[PDB]
Design a protein around this ligand. Sequence first.
Ligand code: CLA
Ligand code: CLA
Ligand code: CLA
Ligand code: CLA
Ligand SMILES: CC(/C=C/C=C(C)/C=C/[C@@]12O[C@]1(C)C[C@@H](O)CC2(C)C)=C\C=C\C=C(C)\C=C\C=C(C)\C=C\[C@@]12O[C@]1(C)C[C@@H](O)CC2(C)C
Ligand code: SF4
Lengths: 48, 219, 74, 203, 742, 42
Amino acid sequence: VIDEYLERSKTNKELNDKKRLATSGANFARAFTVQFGSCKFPENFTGC
Amino acid sequence: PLWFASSQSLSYLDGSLPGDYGFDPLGLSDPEGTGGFIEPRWLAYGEIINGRFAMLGAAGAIAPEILGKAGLIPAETALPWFQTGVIPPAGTYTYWADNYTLFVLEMALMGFAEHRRLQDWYNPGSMGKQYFLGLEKGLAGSGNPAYPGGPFFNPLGFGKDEKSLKELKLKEVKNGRLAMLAILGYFIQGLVTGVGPYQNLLDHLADPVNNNVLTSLKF
Amino acid sequence: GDFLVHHAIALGLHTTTLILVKGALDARGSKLMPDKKDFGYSFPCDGPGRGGTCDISAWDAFYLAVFWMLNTIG
Amino acid sequence: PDRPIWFPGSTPPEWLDGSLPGDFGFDPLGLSSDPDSLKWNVQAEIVHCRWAMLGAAGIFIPEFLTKIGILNTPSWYTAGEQEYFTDKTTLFVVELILIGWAEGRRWADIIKPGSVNTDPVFPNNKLTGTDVGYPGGLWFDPLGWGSGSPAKLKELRTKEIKNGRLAMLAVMGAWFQHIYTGTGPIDNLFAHLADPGHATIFA
Amino acid sequence: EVKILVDRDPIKTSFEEWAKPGHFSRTIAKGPDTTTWIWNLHADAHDFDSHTSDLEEISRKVFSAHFGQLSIIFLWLSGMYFHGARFSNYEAWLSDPTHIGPSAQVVWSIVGQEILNGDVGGGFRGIQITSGFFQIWRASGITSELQLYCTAIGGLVFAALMLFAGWFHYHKAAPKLAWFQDVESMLNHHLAGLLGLGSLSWAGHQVHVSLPINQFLNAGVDPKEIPLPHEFILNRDLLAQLYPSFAEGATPFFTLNWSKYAEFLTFRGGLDPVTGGLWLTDIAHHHLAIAILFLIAGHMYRTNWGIGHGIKDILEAHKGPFTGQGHKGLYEILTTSWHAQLSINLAMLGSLTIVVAHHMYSMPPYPYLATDYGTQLSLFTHHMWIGGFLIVGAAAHAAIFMVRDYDPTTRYNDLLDRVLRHRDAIISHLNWVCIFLGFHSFGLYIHNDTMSALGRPQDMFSDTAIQLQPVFAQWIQNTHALAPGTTAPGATTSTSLTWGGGDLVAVGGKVALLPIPLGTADFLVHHIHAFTIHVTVLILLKGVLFARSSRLIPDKANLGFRFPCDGPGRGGTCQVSAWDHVFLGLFWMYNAISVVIFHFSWKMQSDVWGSISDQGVVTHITGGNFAQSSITINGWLRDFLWAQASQVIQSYGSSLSAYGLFFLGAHFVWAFSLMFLFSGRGYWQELIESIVWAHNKLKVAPATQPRALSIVQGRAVGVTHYLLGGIATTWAFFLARIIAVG
Amino acid sequence: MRDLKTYLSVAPVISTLWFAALAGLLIEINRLFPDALIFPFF
Ligand code: CLA
Ligand code: CLA
Ligand code: CLA
Ligand code: CLA
Ligand SMILES: CC(/C=C/C=C(C)/C=C/[C@@]12O[C@]1(C)C[C@@H](O)CC2(C)C)=C\C=C\C=C(C)\C=C\C=C(C)\C=C\[C@@]12O[C@]1(C)C[C@@H](O)CC2(C)C
Ligand code: SF4
């Protein structure tokens, strides 16, 4: 609001959408992890 | 000597307790309708325990600052009580082990002591029966949970006479109440002013009118 | 597409026939009321006793089968 | 009656007397109120103690010998991943049949105390055990240290039970340490002993 | 005096009572003879007043049930927060709230249901939610998922604490009867402590946490660059840069020169242009004022000290022109029975819920809430239904009290007797009012339909032929529009944009709010609403008043509260109990609420919601056809039911397909209900006789002889199925339309 | 233990356990074999 944080956001505009997309993809894949192949019957013990 | 005594309070406060001035506006120690943690004996026991712990804390939160100002302790050690690592946002210090490891060790030792104390409170003399490396002889207790006595807790043999015991109990109760008030003052001063209590005392003694509660709150 | 509709028609016919046949056969009496023939063809009920007896007559059976007839024809 | 208990000053449950070996009156959940439940729990505890003792030994001896230059055995966690002379399924099936025969014999002994004391093939050989869970005989007690005075038997049984409990705790500790940290238990022990303070679970 | 009184270990915790079902009632505990026993075991489970007669046990059971309900609610809240934390696109929606649809549920991939994972937006696939939780989280200042996880953990902990508290207060230390009968202390603690302190703490949170974070977000700062909430508390320089008043500290508050806090405590009103919601400073100011008011009002009743008021003295010392001695024995009645309190609280809660729905739709308090149409529609309909159900239940509990807890000898009240002595006039007048209102309201529509069907559009009651305008409502609207100019100098603008007069507010190319016109159609629909409400009131009042006795049956109180009839005599006495009156009034409540929600939906879609181009023209969803098509029944059937059902029936093969399936399923359930409403028990019993014979032939006869359902059970099943089917149909249709078109 | 076992044998608890086991087995079978319209083993 002091236009310094706005300038910080403009400088770091990139990779922020990347982080958001990565978080959304992880949230979606939390249901398809088994169908993907990872988190199979082994290593479910205290995992995922 | 009665302080803010009421008709309801005087019914059950017979004066057979140290520091009984008959002050209880809200009727918390009222004799009938007792259950759970609200009981006439449990409240007194908790008051005594809290007073003792408050005396210990009041001495300990001030001793390092006194030693540092007097020059009897290394400067890097003398710190205000909130900068010793109790509140990591306020400050931190490096000890011989991790802070959470210290917490775990303290919790284990304190649990070992307090479980035995609670088991005494439930069963009076049960703590002197089972084998405890020979120390179980001295942990039998005197039948009063608040004052166990014995070689471990009363090695100097104080208070043999009943009147002297009553006087010492009254002194202990009053000192515990004073220490509880001092601890609350420590908390409030640390929250508001932001510096050590001894620094506050020194600033007040320097200029009594310049530094006070109004000074921190301006006006 | 005609298989399921024909089976639905058969179901409607069977249910309507069941209702009407039960109403016709249980007219003279049953276990809930063994003297139904004394009251007549149409009467309201037999009171709240014996757990409650509503729609006990055969007129009520015809009444209930009318709805199924309408649904099947529809 | 006057034996030491788990929580001093407390009252042990009524169904726990003290005649059973390794009895300390610890049963806050009331899982063994029924006598049949007591027998089943005792048998399960004995079997668990023996199996976990064997497992703890077989885990912690090769790792310690691998810390020294004597042996070169791989990590216990990755033992099943390696390749052997046969597929793992065949070994599992053979082990299943072999252990199943003995487990059926033990189950028959548990259900009826005295029906499997004789060798089925040759009627001459016999098992001298007289207590459930202690088969005895030349096969399971060749040295004869089993039978004896009741006090010595109770002392030996208590020793075995306590060792088994410690072994169960050891195996679960090793499993959890390996999954969390990611290194051998001997490495964790040495690292902790080097720096007792900082090298702990909080790291 | 006021004291804490408890009993130690009244009951012992054991599993022996779990093994034997129906231990509370001896008749149930005896054992199952027929199947009806099972149906009874669930009916009398929560009727604590029938298990025993002592008030102490009933009060203790009520307290424990309240604790269990609180634990369940906390578990539900924790689950919602955990779903928001783990499986959601909250972080993606935070940056671009206008172009992303909220979603917090992910469906598995077992059968082929993966088509339900629609393209909500922000690189996520899932079911679009309409709970409005994202707006709440944004208004609270949450910008990450770790905070949501911590909130879920805290909710779990609090639920466990509530369950333990319930167990402790039933089985370890149970309060005595005198503890519950102290209403003055309870009122003082609920007013000063529960309400004032909570609102004060929330105002403090809003002042310290919500306002700076929301200001940074509204400025345009990226959510990942905003300082953490505790940085504002730790760093006074940041707050001084944001709000200079904080640089002065708390000195102004004690100095009484409160104007210095005018930067973050304002009285402007209206909607915020950036987010289309109320100002957060106004909300904090309102919370502070409400906290002050509640704290002041919480010290009115005398408890344990000289100062205060006595409720009994206030009631007894009341003198008035129409009342007289009046309220003399009401204190004992209210402090003796639970049912009267339950009825009063139920009615008040229902009215409050309806008011909440109205105030929430009128003035949106959350950011980016007005432009999300599905959330608004769902909130309005849900709150209306909840309020209606509570209002219905109030009358049933009032009838229960009047039936089983009323005796004029020991506890006598003059007002109740006076009301009971002239019930015929009340019922007759209410019946006449209902008949007149219904005749006029529906005859207007029938006349419009007949005139339009005969090629006579100049004889109808419309804005063009015969005008019936709501002059009083228009006058009120004009007064409210002109209010801030002269009458309320403190406010810069009016409270709401609904009042005729002002400007249009739109956010992100979508209309947020604009003044709502009023015409003949609003007149007709308002009169229809009044007619339906009056009929429901008539039914409930007739049920309540004639519970004890009637001209037809002079001893109805002996039979009880839940009895089917008296017999085939007297011409027929079916459905004479008050339970039947409640079961009949449920239908009319359903009808009224359905009409209200239909009116709200069509009017909002036709006259308010829409889109705006760059030039400045506004295109509404249905193009403003409400004022000319809603004056006839054919218009309601064609332009609303037929036209707006295109989306739900064409949703197959898409992400909305589930809704379509529900649109069928509910229908089925509705028809099923008819089977339980048009028939009787005797036919089913006679059929079960033959079925039981067929079973007996093959030696598969059960010991528990099958029996047909009782009359009351059949009526309850029918009404439950009817209500469930209708409500589910409306839910599916509304959600499908508002998600596919908005 | 006797009373808890007796309670666990009541009709709703046994019914919910049986139906949960059946639903799990059916879901796992349909997962291992995704689609099935005719019996092809013969
Ligand atoms: C229910 C309300 C309702 C109302 C108010 C109207 C009203 C109207 N209709 Mg419609 N209509 C309705 C329903 C209704 N209709 C229905 C259900 C149908 C059948 C589908 C029709 C079919 C219909 C047709 C076919 C026609 C109309 C037409 C008309 C008009 C003719 C009026 C008239 O000639 O007689 C009015 C007669 C009176 C005697 C008035 C009696 C009421 C007085 C004022 C009582 C007031 C009481 C007073 C307060 C008492 C206080 C006492 C105190 C002093 C002590 C009128 C505007 C006609 C038209 O062409 O109009 C344009 C026409 O041809 N209507
Ligand atoms: C309680 C049950 C138990 C179980 C299930 C196992 C299970 C196993 N042991 Mg362990 N072990 C146990 C107790 C147990 N042990 C105890 C009490 C001891 C102390 C004496 C050991 C000491 C031990 C050694 C010294 C070795 C194993 C090995 C093995 C592994 C495979 C070999 C095999 O099982 O044959 C039965 C195994 C033995 C009792 C010892 C004989 C060694 C076998 C025949 C393997 C030799 C193969 C060689 C090292 C690999 C490459 C071959 C080469 C031609 C390339 C397997 C993980 C072997 C290994 O590490 O393989 C990965 C191995 O070298 N164990
Ligand atoms: C605020 C809370 C509230 C409370 C505590 C009570 C309390 C009480 N009510 Mg009242 N009541 C309320 C609100 C409340 N009511 C409302 C809102 C209504 C209007 C509908 C009523 C109408 C009412 C009636 C008509 C009756 C009572 C009676 C009773 C008593 C018996 C309770 C019972 O046995 O149910 C135990 C629970 C059940 C029988 C469960 C029934 C199944 C429900 C109906 C299904 C709902 C399904 C679900 C929402 C949909 C998903 C389907 C899915 C499961 C597949 C009890 C003292 C009864 C009595 O005998 O009083 C003396 C009585 O006859 N109440
Ligand atoms: C849609 C069909 C329907 C209709 C029209 C009605 C109609 C009515 N209900 Mg019923 N009801 C229904 C279904 C219906 N109910 C259902 C499904 C239930 C659930 C069991 C109930 C349960 C029920 C209850 C519990 C109550 C009623 C009551 C009423 C009356 C309300 C008073 C009033 O508005 O009269 C005004 C008239 C009308 C709205 C009817 C239409 C008249 C139009 C305008 C035509 C008039 C034209 C003209 C005169 C005809 C002449 C032509 C001829 C010469 C050839 C009214 C007779 C209430 C009552 O009787 O109290 C007064 C009451 O308490 N009903
Ligand atoms: C135990 C206690 C404090 C203990 C502090 C300790 C150990 C501190 C330790 C440390 O500092 C060291 C050494 C070193 C640091 O590096 C670390 C920490 C950890 C910081 C305070 C109790 C403090 C207790 C207090 C203040 C209690 C106050 C009670 C009051 C006023 C009650 C009043 C009434 O109850 C009556 C009497 C009667 C009723 O009728 C009416 C009302 C009004 C309810
Ligand atoms: S409710 Fe049934 S039994 Fe009672 S009078 Fe009516 S029809 Fe007869």
